[PDB]
Amino acid sequence: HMLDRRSDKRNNSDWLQAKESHPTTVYLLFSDLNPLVTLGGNKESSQQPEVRLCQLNYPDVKGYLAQPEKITLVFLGVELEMRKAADGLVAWFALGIEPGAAEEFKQRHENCYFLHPPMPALLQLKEKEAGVVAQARSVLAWHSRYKFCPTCGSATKIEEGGYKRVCVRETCPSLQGVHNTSYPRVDPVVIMQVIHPDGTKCLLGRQKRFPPGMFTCLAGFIEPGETIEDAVRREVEEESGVKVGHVQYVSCQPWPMPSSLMIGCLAVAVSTEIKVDKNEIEDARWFTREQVVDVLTAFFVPPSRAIAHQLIKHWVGMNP
């Protein structure tokens, strides 16, 4: 990650309040969960215009901050190097604002714009910036849909730097002991590059909503009581009929749509017959290594920053 989350500061109201108006503090502005970005404008993002975060400071956002009931403020962390309250730490916050306010901003700064739609525009951000966006967007998305207490239905209030919501009903069981109802949600999702029993093909599928010709790795949410490997085997068989043996973890990608942790795996199929569950996917097929090589250089796959692309590209290079 690009920041140190400094979760120990989340219950330090005085420190958080002081940092809000400190001149070194960085703000990332969000409207309807979309981050404010800019194209080009420095050396790295120049040779072809690259999308980068529009980093704001207190003088840019002070008017939003002075209406706390209309904003959602999340402490993201501090920069990894300290500069020469006044502790040398450079704080970052995510600031979610109302649409009226965002319009008045868009007329104020012409070079910055809100990134949308989230898929695939978030894949345009460089890795370090994409990670902080995934943190900020996932927490703001949680706040947008978890305003009421799941245990009793009452209103809740934000606490702990944006990382906790607390029911206002004093008698509520959610307030006795520690419960996940207080805290942001992380949904684990397995996504799997599935290799044919003969090592020369891989299994890819699509949903009816996908652009014509796009195919990608099968994926699904891990269920309660399931391991990573269990979910890979179950989801592949559900959607495509294919039975899976060995499952190998490869890498992760946080995917803030709203709050998914993509757990990327390589899996070896032990059967070949395909039986598509139309209620989930429209199509699943075996693609030869040669076909996939042709496409990485009559179907196509997600862009290179998507984990599915990284899994497919990794496989193309493995020893058959």
Ligand X SMILES: Nc1ncnc2c1ncn2[C@@H]1O[C@H](COP(=O)(O)O)[C@@H](O)[C@H]1O
Taking the C-alpha atoms of residue 166 and residue 174, their distance in angstroms, rounded to an integer, is 8
* 53 contacts 129 by C-beta, under 8 angstroms: yes
- Among 17-25, 54-62, 112-120, 169-177, the segment contacting Zn ion (CB under 5 A): 169-177
CB of 274 to ligand X, least distance (A): 16
Spatial CA neighbour of 174 closest among 202, 213, 193, 148:
148
- Encoded one letter per residue, x for contact with its own copies by CB under 8 A and - for no contact, window 218-257 reads ---xxxxxxxxxx---x---x----------x-xxxx-x-
Does residue 219 have a known ligand-binding role?
yes
Alpha carbon distance, N-terminus to C-terminus of the chain: 34
Site string for its own copies, 118-157 (x = CB under 8 A): -------------xxxxxxxxx--x--xxxxxxxxxxx--
State the Cα–Cα distance between residues 179 and 157, nearest whole angstrom: 16
**Cα 95 from Cα 93, distance rounded (Å):** 6
Please state whether beta strands 201-206 and 283-288 pair in parallel, antiparallel, or not at all (unpaired): antiparallel
Torsion of CA 249, 253, 254, 259, to 10 degrees: -60
**Minimum distance from CB of 59 to ligand X (Å)?**
34
Of 33-41, 152-160, 209-217, 235-243, the window that binds Zn ion (rule: CB under 5 A) is 152-160
Q: What are phi and psi of 47, to 5 degrees?
A: -50, -40
Amino acid at residue number 87 = D
Residues 216-235, interacting with ligand X (CB under 6 A): 219-221, 235
- Asked if 115 touches ligand X (CB under 6 A), the answer is no
Using CB under 5 A, list all residues that contact Zn ion: 149, 151-152, 154, 167, 169, 172, 174
Using CB under 5 A, list all residues that contact Mg ion: 219-221, 235, 239, 280
Using CB under 6 A, list all residues that contact ligand X: 178, 180, 183, 187, 219-221, 235, 280
